[PDB]
Design a protein around this ligand. Sequence first.
Ligand SMILES: *[C@@H](CC(=O)OCC)[C@H](C[C@@H]1CCNC1=O)NC(=O)[C@H](CC1CC1)NC(=O)/C=C/c1ccc(C#C)cc1
Ligand SMILES: *[C@@H](CC(=O)OCC)[C@H](C[C@@H]1CCNC1=O)NC(=O)[C@H](CC1CC1)NC(=O)/C=C/c1ccc(C#C)cc1
Lengths: 305, 305
Amino acid sequence: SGFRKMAFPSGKVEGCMVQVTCGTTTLNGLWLDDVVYCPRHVICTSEDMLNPNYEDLLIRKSNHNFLVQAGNVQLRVIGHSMQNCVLKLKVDTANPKTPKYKFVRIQPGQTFSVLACYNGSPSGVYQCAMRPNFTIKGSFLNGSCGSVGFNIDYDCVSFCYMHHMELPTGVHAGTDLEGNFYGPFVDRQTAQAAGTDTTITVNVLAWLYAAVINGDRWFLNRFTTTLNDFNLVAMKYNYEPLTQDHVDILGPLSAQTGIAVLDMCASLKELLQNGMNGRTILGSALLEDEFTPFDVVRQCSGVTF
Amino acid sequence: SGFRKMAFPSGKVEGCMVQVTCGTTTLNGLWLDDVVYCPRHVICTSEDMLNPNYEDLLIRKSNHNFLVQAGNVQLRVIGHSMQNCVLKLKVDTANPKTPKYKFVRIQPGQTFSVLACYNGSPSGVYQCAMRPNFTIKGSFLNGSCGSVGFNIDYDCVSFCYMHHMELPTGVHAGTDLEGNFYGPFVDRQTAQAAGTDTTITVNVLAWLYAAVINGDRWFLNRFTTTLNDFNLVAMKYNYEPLTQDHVDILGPLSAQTGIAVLDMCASLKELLQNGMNGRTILGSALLEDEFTPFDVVRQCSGVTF
Ligand SMILES: *[C@@H](CC(=O)OCC)[C@H](C[C@@H]1CCNC1=O)NC(=O)[C@H](CC1CC1)NC(=O)/C=C/c1ccc(C#C)cc1
Ligand SMILES: *[C@@H](CC(=O)OCC)[C@H](C[C@@H]1CCNC1=O)NC(=O)[C@H](CC1CC1)NC(=O)/C=C/c1ccc(C#C)cc1
């Protein structure tokens, strides 16, 4: 028993990380088959970042201006192209460590692991959620751009995130691996606001299920509630509306625990209106919304990869 | 910026995980050179575990009673020995993926990463602290025994923990890689008490520094305190006393933020006496004590492996 914020094992992604240097600028790239993916702002001067014209900056760049290093082996760049906010560098060698992989665009509320890297070398791994306002609460210093987010299924790495920037509020923004930003952000050094962020109601419920399995059952109540009744209280606290799809997603947890979904909703409604009166849930004094229902099942059933 | 509970990249350890079976009992082993290390209770049945005589049980076992799989290849066991609570299984081929490694006995208050495994395959990675009462707050199901905790120093993997059991309070207990339990525990299915746990004061301070680095500074006050005055209050709240060794360890963090250790101690002294007043620190309503000063420096300055 016990419940921890758990990342995927990173080994398959570690073997794809490389260092990419353009002039004064070094960051991380992802090396899959014969292609290295990285943020296109590798080509920028620190001046350029205020308002980069990326098309014109790239024209001044030849293949030899891109230094790609994998371990201590320089890879030879034989082509370059810009797709949205990512740069694709063709190299003369395919990564022998390329795992089975897919590029995916995740949905707000879904989770993934981040392998934070510097100079092409992995430094640590942690689990994030895509917030409803399309930011992530990460841990990223200068030099970390090019770090990627991913899920794993058995043997397949689903790449869903590449890191590009921090907002004034201290949260993080990035692209999918096709270079398309999540949310309304652009890759330049300027004031950028994220939306108001809501709480991922379906994830809080899944987490409450995990808590019950694990000994924290004091918030369960005799009362019940309807979906519409529950949702009226949810808006008041800035929680995402709960839909029948969300109910159905929670179905398996309901079954394994014998706690109907709307009974847990009733417990969450009462937690929201009255707080925790000195008790904790899975060691936290705040409701936690960055475990999906699948995360909860994976962790409480020992799913492997 | 940002501050997350961050595990070490796990690839070097994933390549050493294997499945170990003896009769009806399957758990994880750690394959380094031509030795597989696993918990000795792999040789027990369910009944045996109420009160095992491990020496007698091992005598009934032969090399061929031990089934070791590395991926889908079977490794032939050619020798076996008990060392304290771990079994050493000599195999016919050395692990080509063996990292540079050390076996270390860690100290209470130190942290490490756990690669939680089932049937020899990794399911996830997370950061734990060895509590002052020599338990860890992990996430372990049946089948997870033999999972290891470790730290990485550039290319060197320091293995410090192997998982063996769960206590009635829901926390976890295990051994170093020589088979010596942390704390007063035995590998038998009986109710066992850990002591009263205490809060790792030096770690809370380190986290307060991480909070300031990252924009949560409301708790800073203009006072200072003595190590003796501070420790009189700490002990009222079940905090480990702070020594001069602890101050010195916090020195570099002090220097990088310009906040003297004893000024942060004054801040923590107020937080304990006045509570947080519904404010949060790094997204927490509670004081966090599972980040060491080194964890904070490494994350807030980008050390890589
Ligand atoms: C990755 C940079 C990198 O690795 O390449 C340079 C070697 C950076 C990650 C940032 C660094 C600090 N925390 C992060 O997550 N990315 C950047 O620095 C962005 C580069 C621009 C996209 C092209 N820039 C920023 O993140 C800055 C954002 C910002 C602008 C203005 C204000 C105000 C007021 C606040 C934040
Ligand atoms: C891993 C053992 C394993 O994988 O063996 C099967 C091949 C187990 C991890 C436990 C399982 C539940 N959560 C865990 O972390 N380890 C064990 O099951 C222990 C085996 C004994 C060392 C020989 N047994 C326990 O951990 C159980 C302890 C216990 C809890 C509560 C009470 C009471 C009242 C009495 C004993």
